[PDB]
Design a protein around this nucleic acid. Structure first.
Ligand SMILES: CC(=O)O[C@H]1C[C@@]2(C)[C@@H](C[C@@H](O)[C@H]3[C@@]4(C)CC[C@@H](O)[C@@H](C)[C@@H]4CC[C@@]32C)/C1=C(\CCC=C(C)C)C(=O)O
Ligand SMILES: Nc1nc2c(ncn2[C@@H]2O[C@H](COP(=O)(O)OP(=O)(O)O)[C@@H](O)[C@H]2O)c(=O)[nH]1
Ligand SMILES: [K+]
Ligand SMILES: [K+]
Ligand SMILES: [K+]
Ligand SMILES: [Mg+2]
Ligand SMILES: [Mg+2]
Ligand SMILES: [Mg+2]
Ligand SMILES: [Mg+2]
Ligand SMILES: [Mg+2]
Ligand SMILES: [Mg+2]
Ligand SMILES: [Mg+2]
Ligand SMILES: [Mg+2]
Ligand SMILES: [Mg+2]
Ligand SMILES: [Mg+2]
Ligand SMILES: [Mg+2]
Ligand SMILES: [Mg+2]
Ligand SMILES: [Mg+2]
Ligand SMILES: [Zn+2]
Lengths: 213, 205, 647
RNA sequence: CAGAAGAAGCACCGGCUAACUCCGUGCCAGCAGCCGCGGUAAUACGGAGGGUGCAAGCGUUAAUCGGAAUUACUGGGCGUAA
RNA sequence: ACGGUCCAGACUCCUACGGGAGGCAGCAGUGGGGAAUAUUGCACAAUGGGCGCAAGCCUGAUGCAGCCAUGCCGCGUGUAU
RNA sequence: AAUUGAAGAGUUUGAUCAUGGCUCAGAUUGAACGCUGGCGGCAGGCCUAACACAUGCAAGUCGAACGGUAACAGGAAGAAG
């Protein structure tokens, strides 16, 4: 069967392919190219585990210095078929995820977006709240709603570890009778979809959520 | 250029039957004529003076199925013509072939009459006319096409016309399906419910 | 000229290979022997490889020029690889035979050693340097001696006895090399059968066209020797538009449908614009290659890429220094048209009823980014216009204004590439601007903890906040620890807002404050005098007071860099990393290469690719990822503070 | 000759001004010709349901005249409003 | 004296450097400017004009076509159940 | 027969009457812009730079004024395969 590569894995595979393609053009040394080719082949093989003939063929095409971007795109499309799209919960489930948010509404998300997104994040501009839903390591769905700063600055995004336009995202601890509460946050990409495509490691995002906690 | 929305809703807003249905069944049975259209339709607001004038103008347009631009142009002609503007305007609307075909009973509803006229099923004075706006002069003979004589709808429409009151100004012959517009309908002959004065005042505004 | 007699060639070489001079000599000697030769001169410098790439895409053949002294240079390898990518048939021409230390055999050996190309000499030089007087043709087994400096008098003589044995040996090697690609030639070679000149030429030509063999010639453009023989080789071995594989495009309506544009005058017109130039006399010149059909001057054509109708006012054929207006351009020809307003480089031109799109050239992303600041506002406007025009001419050039900093960032394929464009902007457009490395994103933080009171004083607002430094990458933490309603709950959001706003604006150089914990533990309010604004101001005042006590510092982004290089160049790289305030974390051998992992500031990684290439002779590559923010050294920090505060 | 097939959108709903509620937001984001609206129960902000007005158009902006007896000839005024 | 002459000037162009050529506020069109305004069409079949004994020739006048929701007007996008 | 013609409203006050300015409801356009867009007839379409203009075309006609024949299409005549 097709390897069920994670969306973050697929993003990583694309990046290494782009590097490999860059390497072919960039590098004027055959030996260096060979080292990169072997590395790329090994890395892709590890991600896919067992490799079918289609992956093998693609790898062969990738290994060839005559590899083309058009070929890459087709290879990416094939690899995209291997990818599994992010699951979307029932509307009833959504309300269970955010019981505190009464009549919470989720906007429509593209299936392609789900396929390329490790987590789903939608931002309500009126409330200045971004809602992020992600299935945990146990695969239990987890939803967090946090304030997003209106001001936007260019800095390395914590979620993806990639420099982009980012705004401070703060998560509020449960209030008490005293009215004491703690908000902890770090800069995150304003566009969740761009962030999802940028992210190459599910663990990094997992850590980021842990940082908010 | 034509309103294709639900016909009864127009009647509900006016609060009176606009005769936009065949009348095979009572309007009350078909819809809640009493209630105005919409969620807040049951609530009745006090009508502003502008509102009263608007509603009258809307009623007439809805009955005759005439758009504002065309209806505005009619008012100007009615004013231009000598005599009572209100009466002239109402006569001009009646002169429309669409109304004439309906009044003769060839069409069950004015919209159905429009389809017959539009689809070249009606001949006036032996020339085919596809214009609803066409004004039928006195002593003009309007007859259905022989091809369209066979159509079932027209025959049924005649029966529905028998139920309705017959205009004095229009003489119609069954089977022959020819009608002669003897005279332009008098204001007295026209329905009293329509108030011409309100329409005149609105356009004078 | 017929399609069969047309040759579209380009001249490629390393810097100072005598490439331009070679072109000059060709034009001087020339149309050649009843054949039409269209020449496109490609740049030698590594920074203008894009110009070479575009030229190679539209060319049917190419001539590699090598320096007899130098042989294959790194630039040669790069251009060779580009030509290999596009599968352009090519011949090799040794140049600067007169140059002292010229060695033909060495140059040939470097072709095999560096490029691993199946290249064999079709000619042998007699003498070297000042003693170079004649060339032996191995195909015809004849010797051509140049008696004059102009090279207009070539005497065909018998191969001298001293070089006859050499010539026979070299011919045998030539036949063997060609025979590897030709079964017919191999049979004759193995059987020791006499291979006719015509049969040998045909075999070489076929092998050259298939990009399986590379005929090597020798000469000196400066001394006007061997250029005519090279032109003969161009005619003999290099393909016509008919010989080359027809270009494949796609329909604009159906991208999936592949349409092949064969070189035919009677076919539908299809051409590709590959160069645009602004001329003082004629205005905008668009150079285009016609692949199929014909186009007449004054006709209307369709830009299939843009879906725009355009009219060609004139057709200009280049003739060395002279230029000629032509009425019609035919298939396979390369010419310039005037009046194409919307046509850019890479755009396909076709008949109005045709919708073919030829494969466009892909432009690389900028590898170097620099900040350009105009000296005056008037210069800014001129700069913007200049940048647009330059971007129109060169799509690999990217110029955009950073909205945050207001700085104009220019991106290019090389430092020289950017320097030229800056110089052009200064000279052509008279724009005075200052160019520097783009300012790196910086963040501030606190090193020490302190409890501070912010009081605003009716209008009353009093807050007591404790600021403590957070762990690196922990972000900002605000804690409301007010107990007993010392501060009304209604004003707490205002306090937070005041802090947040102040943090975003920074305390030192105006960079956002990160990795800090703020705990509101105490305050005071007045029932009548307290307002939301007062508490917001009080919070802002508290941060200012904290800035004086909490020892603020500037942070710079630290990048984790993985460098892969040969072990021979490891020493130089290690020194380079250390010189850039970088720390090597680890080193691992991978096959024949060495991999170095290091942490370097992003501020010091600007232009690292060029330095790496220089240090490793282009045998090293690197990958970098953001790791963490680290405190900037005091000396740099002061400079940053000065720059931002306008000191 | 075949077949409803191939063919509806735009602005507006606090008052002036025909057309209303719900939800989100919380002197914020916003709106606005005028009057004004928005600080946690917004028919005035944004969206949705519903409605009104127009319709191959519908709004907006600019421009001219009118309403303006507000340069008054038609057709105004001058104690205290100029 | 729009598509005549001469002179002077500013502009553009040619040149053998001596000297020369030109004027879309006719039609279409290009560049520029602007918030913004059309095709380098067809025909002299008709009307009218010039010349001619006439035939005819000439006519970007004119008759038509192209583009544009820019306006005006009419009609449709179904109609009964 | 060549007429048929004439609407106000909001806003100064705690409230009022007056005065008085401001604003809105209408009509119209060589319009422009945004959103949207089926067809036809008819009409209109550089208001800006009286800015600069590539290229073609917009003024010719008369052999019944004249010498002629540059053509060409014939004729006659004379040589000719
Ligand atoms: C004719 C040819 O082959 O290359 C010419 C053409 C050339 C490549 C020029 C150098 C350089 O401006 C080039 C760039 C990329 C410079 C940046 C932009 O302005 C481009 C729009 C421009 C296009 C080509 C151009 C104008 C040439 C060189 C290279 C000169 C070498 C050095 C070291 C400065 C040349 O002539 O030798
Ligand atoms: N000695 C010698 N010099 C040459 C020869 N051919 C060219 N040159 C010179 O070497 C330099 C090379 O520059 P250029 O011709 O522009 O070639 P490019 O630098 O490769 O583009 C110029 O000064 C040439 O005149 C040659 O055959 N012999
Ligand atoms: K008076
Ligand atoms: K005529
Ligand atoms: K008033
Ligand atoms: Mg209409
Ligand atoms: Mg050169
Ligand atoms: Mg109302
Ligand atoms: Mg509310
Ligand atoms: Mg007045
Ligand atoms: Mg007065
Ligand atoms: Mg006073
Ligand atoms: Mg006074
Ligand atoms: Mg004149
Ligand atoms: Mg003129
Ligand atoms: Mg003109
Ligand atoms: Mg413009
Ligand atoms: Mg003419
Ligand atoms: Zn991100």
């Amino acid at each position: 069967m097709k390897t069920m590569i994670y969306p973050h894995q697929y993003n990583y595979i694309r990046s290494v392919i782009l590097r490999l393609k860059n390497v072919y053009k960039t590098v004027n040394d055959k030996e260096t190219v060979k080292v990169i080719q072997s590395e790329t082949y090994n890395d892709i093989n590890e991600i896919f585990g067992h490799i079918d003939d289609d992956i093998e063929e693609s790898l062969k095409v990738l290994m060839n210095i005559r590899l083309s971007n058009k070929e890459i795109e087709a290879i990416l499309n094939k690899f995209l078929e291997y990818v599994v799209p992010f699951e979307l919960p029932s509307p009833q489930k959504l309300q269970k995820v955010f019981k505190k948010v009464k009549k919470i509404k989720i906007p429509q998300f593209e299936e392609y977006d789900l396929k390329v997104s490790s987590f789903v994040g939608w931002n309500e501009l009126a409330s200045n709240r971004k809602y992020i839903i992600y299935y945990d390591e146990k695969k239990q769905l987890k939803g967090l709603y946090g304030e997003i700063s209106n001001q936007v600055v260019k800095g390395f995004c914590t979620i993806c570890n990639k420099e982009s336009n980012v705004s401070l995202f703060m998560k509020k601890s449960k209030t008490n009778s005293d009215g004491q509460y703690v908000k902890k946050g770090d800069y995150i990409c304003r566009d969740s979809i761009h962030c999802n495509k940028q992210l190459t490691d599910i663990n990094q995002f997992y850590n980021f959520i842990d940082k908010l906690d | 250029a034509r309103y294709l929305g639900p016909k009864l809703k127009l009647s509900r807003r006016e609060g009176t039957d606009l005769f936009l249905k065949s009348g095979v069944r009572a309007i009350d049975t078909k819809c809640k004529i009493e209630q105005a259209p919409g969620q807040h339709g049951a609530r009745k607001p006090r009508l502003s003076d502008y509102g009263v004038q608007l509603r009258e103008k809307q009623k007439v347009r809805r009955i005759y199925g005439v758009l504002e631009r065309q209806f505005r142009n009619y008012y100007k002609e009615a004013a231009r013509l000598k005599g009572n503007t209100g009466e002239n305007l109402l006569a001009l609307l009646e002169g429309r072939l669409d109304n004439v075909v309906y009044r003769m009973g060839f069409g069950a509803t004015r919209a159905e009459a429009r389809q017959l006229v539009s689809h070249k099923a009606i001949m006036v004075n032996g020339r085919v006319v596809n214009i609803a706006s066409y004004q039928v002069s006195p002593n003009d003979v309007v007859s259905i096409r022989e091809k369209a004589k066979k159509q079932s709808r027209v025959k049924a429409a005649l029966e529905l016309a028998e139920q309705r009151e017959k205009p004095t100004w229009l003489e119609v012959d069954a089977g022959k399906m020819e009608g002669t517009f003897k005279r332009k309908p008098e204001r007295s002959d026209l329905s009293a419910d329509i108030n011409e004065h309100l329409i005149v005042e609105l356009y004078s505004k | 000229f017929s399609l069969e007699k047309t040759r579209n060639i380009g001249i490629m070489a390393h810097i100072d290979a005598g490439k331009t001079t070679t072109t000059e000599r060709i034009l001087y000697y020339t149309a050649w022997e009843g054949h039409r030769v269209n020449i496109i001169d490609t740049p030698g410098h590594v920074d203008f490889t894009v110009e070479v790439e575009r030229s190679l895409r539209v060319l049917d053949g190419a001539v590699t020029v090598l320096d007899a002294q130098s042989g294959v240079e790194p630039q040669t390898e790069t251009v060779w690889r580009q030509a290999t990518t596009y599968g352009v048939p090519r011949i090799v021409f040794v140049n600067k035979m007169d140059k002292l230390g010229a060695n033909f055999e060495y140059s040939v050996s470097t072709l095999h050693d560096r490029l691993q190309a199946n290249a064999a000499p079709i000619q042998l030089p007699i003498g070297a340097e000042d003693e170079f007087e004649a060339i032996i043709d191995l195909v015809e087994m004849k010797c051509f001696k140049y008696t004059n400096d102009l090279g207009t008098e070539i005497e065909e003589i018998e191969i001298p006895e001293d070089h006859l044995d050499r010539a026979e040996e070299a011919r045998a090697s030539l036949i063997e090399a060609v025979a590897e690609t030709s079964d017919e030639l191999m049979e004759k070679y193995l059987g020791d059968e006499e291979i006719s000149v015509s049969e040998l030429k045909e075999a070489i030509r076929q092998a050259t066209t298939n990009v399986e063999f590379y005929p090597v010639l020798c000469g000196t453009a400066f001394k006007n020797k061997g250029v005519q023989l090279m032109l003969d080789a161009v005619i003999d071995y290099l393909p016509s538009p008919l010989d080359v594989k027809p270009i494949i495009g796609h329909r604009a309506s159906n991208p999936e449908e592949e349409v092949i544009a064969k070189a035919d005058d009677s076919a539908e017109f299809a051409a590709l614009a590959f160069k645009v130039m602004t001329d003082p006399y004629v205005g905008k010149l668009t150079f285009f290659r016609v692949y199929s059909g014909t186009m007449t001057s004054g006709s209307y054509v369709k830009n299939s890429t843009k879906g725009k109708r355009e009219r060609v006012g004139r057709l200009l054929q280049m003739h060395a220094n002279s230029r000629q207006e032509i009425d019609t351009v035919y298939s396979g020809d390369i010419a310039a048209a005037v009046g194409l307003k919307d046509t850019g480089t890479g755009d396909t031109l076709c008949g109005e009823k045709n919708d073919i799109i030829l494969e466009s050239m892909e432009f690389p992303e900028p590898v170097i980014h620099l900040s350009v600041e105009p000296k005056s506002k008037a210069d800014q406007d001129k700069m913007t216009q200049a940048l647009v025009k330059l971007q129109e001419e060169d799509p690999t050039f990217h110029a955009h204004t950073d909205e945050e900093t207001g700085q104009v960032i220019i991106g290019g394929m090389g430092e020289l590439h950017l320097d030229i464009l800056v110089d052009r902007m200064k000279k052509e457009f008279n724009v005075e601007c200052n160019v520097g490395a783009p300012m790196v994103s910086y963040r501030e933080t606190f090193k020490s903890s302190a409890q501070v009171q912010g009081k605003f004083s009716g209008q009353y607002g009093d807050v007591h906040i404790e600021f403590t430094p957070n762990e690196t990458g922990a972000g900002f933490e605000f804690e409301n620890a007010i107990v007993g309603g010392v501060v009304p709950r209604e004003y707490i959001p205002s306090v937070e807002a005041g802090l947040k706003d102040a943090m975003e604006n920074g305390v030192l150089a105006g960079y956002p404050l990160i990795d800090v914990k703020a705990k509101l533990y105490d305050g005071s309010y007045h029932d009548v005098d307290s307002s939301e604004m007062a508490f917001k101001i009080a919070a802002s005042l508290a941060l200012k007071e904290a800035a004086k006590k909490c020892d603020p510092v500037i942070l710079e982004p630290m990048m984790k860099v993985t460098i892969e290089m040969p072990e021979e160049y490891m020493g130089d790289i290690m020194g380079d990393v250390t010189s850039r305030r970088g720390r090597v974390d680890g080193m691992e051998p991978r096959g024949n290469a060495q991999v170095v992992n290091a942490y370097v500031p992003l501020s010091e990684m600007f232009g690292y690719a060029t330095s790496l290439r220089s240090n490793t002779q282009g045998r090293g590559t690197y990958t970098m990822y953001f790791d963490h923010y680290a405190e900037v050294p005091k000396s740099i920090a002061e400079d940053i503070i000065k720059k931002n505060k306008g000191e």
